[PDB]
Amino acid sequence: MLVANINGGFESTPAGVVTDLAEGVEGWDLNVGSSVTNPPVFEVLETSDAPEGNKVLAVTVNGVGNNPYDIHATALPVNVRPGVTYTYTIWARAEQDGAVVSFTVGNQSHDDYGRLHEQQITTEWQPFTFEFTVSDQETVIRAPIHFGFAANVGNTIYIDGLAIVD
Ligand SMILES: [Ca+2]
Ligand SMILES: [Ca+2]
Numbered sequence: 001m002l003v004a005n006i007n008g009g010f011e012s013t014p015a016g017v018v019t020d021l022a023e024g025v026e027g028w029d030l031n032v033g034s035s036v037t038n039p040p041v042f043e044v045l046e047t048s049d050a051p052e053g054n055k056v057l058a059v060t061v062n063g064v065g066n067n068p069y070d071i072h073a074t075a076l077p078v079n080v081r082p083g084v085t086y087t088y089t090i091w092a093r094a095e096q097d098g099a100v101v102s103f104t105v106g107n108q109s110h111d112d113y114g115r116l117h118e119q120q121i122t123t124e125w126q127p128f129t130f131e132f133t134v135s136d137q138e139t140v141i142r143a144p145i146h147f148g149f150a151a152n153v154g155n156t157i158y159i160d161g162l163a164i165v166d
Pocket of ligand 2: 022023024025026027028029076
């Protein structure tokens with residue numbers, strides 16, 4: 001496929017705990033909000049339990065901040081053409097039931113093109129998919145995934161297989 005995002009399945013990244021949140025995982029920016037006082041752990045896992053390849057990203061939430069994006073994994077850059085309609089697809093599961101995640105796509109002004117908001121994540125892998133249109137003149141966009149929900153404290157969420165395709 002003609003994919004707009006880079007390293008969507010983490011297959012380019014060495015397994016281990018991420019200590020470089022900005023540049024340790026090619027094609028993604030991980031960050032933690034200054035309001036989060038019990039920080040999360042991000043880890044690339046090498047596993048047979050992957051929907052794609054053998055790597056997944058595991059996000060362990062230990063506490064939250066003020067905003068759901070205060071614990072996030074954002075695909076960036078996401079290279080796109082104005083006016084085009086894309087299909088976003090990703091897989092996610094959690095260690096315990098009751099996890100909540102938002103899968104968004106938006107521009108550098110932090111306006112969304114679309115999202116799957118506050119999705120219930122279960123202990124089995126499930127696909128989350130939506131279409132969105134680049135409705136402005138942007139060519140470099142981003143795909144923020146929000147993990148900072150109280151529901152997630154004590155849980156680990158696993159993501160894999162992000163594809164943003166024409
Ligand atoms: Ca993968
Ligand atoms: Ca980066």
